[PDB]
């Protein structure tokens, strides 16, 4: 099957802290249990280093964590995209310096 | 005359925003009626 990039906008799933979603599953799969009783990414580099012949730091973050979020424009009813990689020092990156944003004025 | 057009488009959807708001405020009423009888069974059994 092909990779449809538009389904990553239209499938209703996002980020979660998931610590509440471990205790909600640890007390769910223990019921269950009580009744009862090198990685793949390093082989992706040689996947690119043989098919391309080089490193290409442009393609290096196409292997890492990519979030593709859809939003909209308040001027002309339009759509656009909010993007954050993993290794980005930009917002939403998982290598970023504090201080970061606070959605407090948008709630106060 | 555009002020006569756009204010009618604002306020008629503004009731529809409130017909959405009186439907969306019906949503936190739900599980506050659902599990309040299911929270009965906790310490007993």
């Amino acid at each position: 099957p092909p990779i449809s990039p538009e389904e990553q906008l239209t499938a209703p799933g996002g980020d979660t802290a998931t610590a509440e979603d471990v205790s909600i599953t640890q007390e769910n799969e223990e019921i269950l249990a009580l009744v009862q009783r090198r990685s793949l990414v390093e082989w992706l580099d040689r996947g690119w280093e043989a098919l391309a012949g080089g490193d290409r730091p442009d393609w290096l973050w196409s292997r890492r964590s990519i979030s593709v979020v859809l939003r909209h424009h308040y001027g002309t009813k339009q759509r656009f995209v909010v993007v954050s990689y993993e290794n980005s020092v930009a917002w939403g990156g998982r290598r970023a310096r504090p201080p970061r944003l606070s959605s407090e004025l948008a709630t106060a | 005359e555009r002020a006569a057009v756009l204010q009618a488009q604002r306020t008629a959807a503004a009731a529809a925003l409130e017909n959405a708001a009186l439907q969306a405020a019906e949503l936190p009423v739900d599980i506050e009626r659902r599990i309040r009888p299911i929270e009965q069974q906790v310490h007993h059994i």
Binding site: - | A16, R34, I38
Partner: protein
């Protein structure tokens, strides 16, 4: 018999109703949450 099984139905009838007490919370959360977006479909008909 009655010393080992007379308290089973306290745990059995509890474990045969939460199947029913939580599936009634399914559809009553899918008969009542779909109406919000359908009312939001109405706003796009006006705006």
């Amino acid at each position: 018999r009655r010393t080992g099984r007379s308290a089973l139905a306290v745990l059995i009838r509890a474990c045969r109703r939460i199947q029913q007490q939580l599936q009634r919370t399914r559809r009553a959360l899918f008969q009542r949450s779909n109406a919000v977006l359908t009312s939001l479909h109405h706003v796009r008909m006006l705006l």
